[PDB]
Write a protein that binds this ligand. Structure first.
Ligand SMILES: Nc1ncnc2c1ncn2[C@@H]1O[C@H](COS(=O)(=O)NC(=O)[C@@H](N)CO)[C@@H](O)[C@H]1O
Ligand SMILES: Nc1ncnc2c1ncn2[C@@H]1O[C@H](COS(=O)(=O)NC(=O)[C@@H](N)CO)[C@@H](O)[C@H]1O
Lengths: 447, 447
């Protein structure tokens, strides 16, 4: 939700951002909310004018009670003021309603640092890490995507896709999942199940060492926490609703983590509130149904360890910068080469002001693929969920800033590990850092 | 689902089991489906009679093509025949639907060893284990439910309820969960989060050592798998359905685990199939809303590690006995005193032929509470999901038997650990076997 103040004190700023975002069909809204806001304040001034008249007509009726007192008329004028006052009041409500409708449907204003672009092809790489294992046949793509700024080793044999590796490793059963639930669902098996849990504990442990309170949130939440966390389009594209209830399956622990303090005035001495949640995630992935990667890259359910932050507006950008580094550390320990990107205006999304993604190099796919997202949400969620804070019981509570970032979404971490640590025969070596969690050091093909 | 051959050859057997179960209402169905199945079988006979007649009547109508051919009378019967075959066919389909309606709503035949009883009270304790810590004010109920066959020790201080311990330890937030999702939902925090995951890993490692294949199933399944795993009653009372979708939230890994091999003829050589699934579980818990325990004992969402077994009918009873002991073993290492009960016909449920429950002694509650349940479903689920096996590609495939049993449902294992291992000052010592998983040796109060 946008602050009405901001559109009043700089409509051109919001219109131009809408254009940098590709939300042109919504530029015409800035003026609409303005003329509505204007009408809103005009009627209110009218109401006070009337409240004042009510007072005058009052002292006047009584002033006659001592005199001739032909009041009758004054009493009828009095009757019209209340009649009128009520109307204006109800007219002012409807007006606030139309104004907020737009306010809730406008994306967060982007930060000056986010590059301008049309889509994912305009995202800007800003950092690279690791030594990529590239197939001779992906060399140009790799080089263009890495901008020659990343170390790499050329591979003789052709590296396999994660889906095929799950098969040779006996780690999944897709066909029986399709029979039981439909496409893009799966049964995960054997060592891959241990690997999934291991990834959760590892992520969990590290964020805990950095001071994050671990949490297992509700997996089903009430509609308001969903509309308080993202744009309404998500109800059609990503979010599942459960029949006959005000319950929605969460698409990320982020949402229940943000609703956690809905309608609170936090005590500033506590900020920043640091949460690291674990939870399964459910998404419709409606926009797609059969794009390309056929295993566990883009499915209906996956596990994710999530970082969530409540900070002072003056501390958020610094936090943003820390959470993305927190995710970067995990993948470095997991020995996964990657590049982090600054997402452009057109591929940014409604909630964030600025967003960084970690796209891991996927030897088999021959490309960098999103594996984590870190967003600084400014006060966009706070203004919706009414999450404020006060430093002195004195007064004036202000909205907090919220941030979120993937620590590890196991689904894609597993693909990154299978594709990046595979050997010619299919054997997949597991990063030393996880040995304490898994037991085994590698996963060998079955026969 | 019950086998119709079974109700045709031994109707007394099934109505007697229905009366044992105290299902006087549906004892009537046996006669009903018998009469419906008779009509069905007969009309079916009629169909072939007429069909063969139609041919023999069309061969003699042409034999008249070479003769006088006063076939007008014949041409008329040939038309009466098809019109007859047509209505019979529809009568048949209608008949099949009515009998199936019943066949699918009929409980499994109980094993003679299942005690007759009306509700939980008539469940029979057959084994006890451990040394209970009993508050003096609970002495009577403890001896009542322990039969005085269990070692114990009287506490002069009143041990607390898990809900209060969760508060003092700082391991949960219920108020905020109610805000965001509704009642009987929660946020788990700090060490409780780690303990939860540690219990899942502990249960998995143990079942894996015993040769169970670890699996993470789909958490949402199509209606047919649910209808294949329980009684239809469960759609109203327990299972959440997702809007505009043939998807249902699973109440236990047992369901997708059973759905996994729906419509297959397994190779007997592969029997038994041993699976240990992990997954969150969702239940409506409609018959309640406010009963008694108000923490994480009866909630809408919990984690459970499930044991599932596909076996030859000749091995199912020995496996029933092995999986309950698998669960007992976990609870003994967890140092939780308990008793196990053979469930009476009244509290049995529709899919089990026999069931054992492990009831953990709960110091704070002052009573034994169900913590795990284990069943032998015989061929009830197998007949519904069409799961058969065959040793030689030559033989008629026959139905397998299925079994399921809790390994550890983390919610109740956690209340058991909190209540049995609390000290007077509020700290809880976590059992040794879990140290390798939790890291910490106990959980001390916060202030
Ligand atoms: N449909 C999906 N299937 C598998 N993994 C997914 C899916 N959607 C997202 N993910 C994983 O989860 C990560 C985070 O999801 S995200 O929508 O980009 N961002 C969020 O959810 C934020 N709350 C930050 O985690 C993705 O980068 C990816 O690693
Ligand atoms: N609503 C609930 N809230 C919390 N824990 C629950 C709930 N329902 C069941 N459990 C836990 O899960 C266990 C198994 O549930 S059960 O219905 O008895 N049996 C099953 O689900 C079988 N698949 C065996 O696990 C219970 O013993 C209890 O420990």
């Amino acid at each position: 939700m946008l602050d009405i103040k901001l559109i009043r004190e700089n409509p051109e700023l919001v219109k131009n951002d809408l254009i940098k975002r590709g939300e042109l069909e919504k530029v015409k809204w800035v003026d609409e909310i303005l003329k509505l806001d204007t009408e809103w304040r005009t009627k209110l001034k009218e109401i006070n004018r009337l409240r004042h008249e009510r007072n005058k007509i009052a002292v006047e009726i009584g002033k006659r009670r001592k005199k001739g007192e032909p009041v009758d008329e004054l009493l009828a004028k009095s009757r019209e003021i209340v009649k009128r006052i009520g109307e204006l009041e109800n007219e002012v409500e409807e007006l606030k309603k139309k104004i907020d409708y737009y306010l809730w449907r406008l994306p967060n204003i982007t930060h000056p640092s986010v590059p301008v672009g049309k889509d994912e092809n305009d995202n800007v790489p800003i950092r690279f890490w690791g030594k990529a294992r590239v197939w001779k046949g992906h060399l140009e793509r790799f080089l263009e995507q890495s901008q020659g700024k990343m170390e790499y080793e050329i591979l003789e044999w052709k590296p396999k896709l994660h889906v095929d590796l799950l098969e040779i490793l006996g780690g999944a059963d897709f066909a029986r999942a399709a029979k039981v639930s439909g496409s893009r669902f799966y049964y995960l098996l054997n060592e891959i199940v241990i690997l999934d849990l291991a990834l959760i504990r590892f992520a969990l442990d590290r964020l805990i060492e950095k001071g994050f309170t671990p949490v297992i949130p509700p997996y089903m939440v009430r509609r308001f926490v969903e509309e308080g966390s993202t744009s309404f389009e998500d109800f059609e594209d990503v979010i599942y609703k459960v029949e006959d209830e005000d319950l929605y399956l969460i698409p990320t622990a982020e949402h229940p983590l943000a609703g956690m303090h809905a309608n609170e005035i936090l005590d500033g001495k506590d900020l920043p509130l640091l949460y690291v949640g674990v939870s399964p995630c459910f998404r419709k992935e409606a926009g797609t149904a059969g794009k390309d990667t056929k295993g566990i890259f883009r499915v209906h359910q996956f596990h994710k360890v999530e970082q969530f932050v409540y900070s002072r507006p003056e501390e958020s950008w610094e936090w943003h910068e820390k959470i993305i580094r927190n995710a970067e550390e995990l993948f470095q320990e997991l020995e996964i080469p990657y590049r982090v990107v600054n997402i452009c205006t057109g591929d940014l999304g409604y909630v964030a002001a600025k967003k960084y993604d970690i796209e891991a190099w996927m030897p088999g796919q021959g490309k960098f693929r999103e594996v984590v997202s870190a967003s600084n949400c400014t006060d966009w969620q706070a203004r919706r969920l009414n999450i404020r804070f006060r430093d002195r019981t004195d007064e004036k509570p202000r909205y907090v800033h919220t941030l979120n970032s993937t620590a590890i979404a196991t689904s894609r971490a597993i693909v990154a590990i299978l594709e990046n640590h595979q050997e010619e025969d299919g054997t997949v070596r597991i990063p030393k850092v996880l040995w304490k969690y898994t037991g085994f050091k590698e996963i060998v093909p079955v026969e």
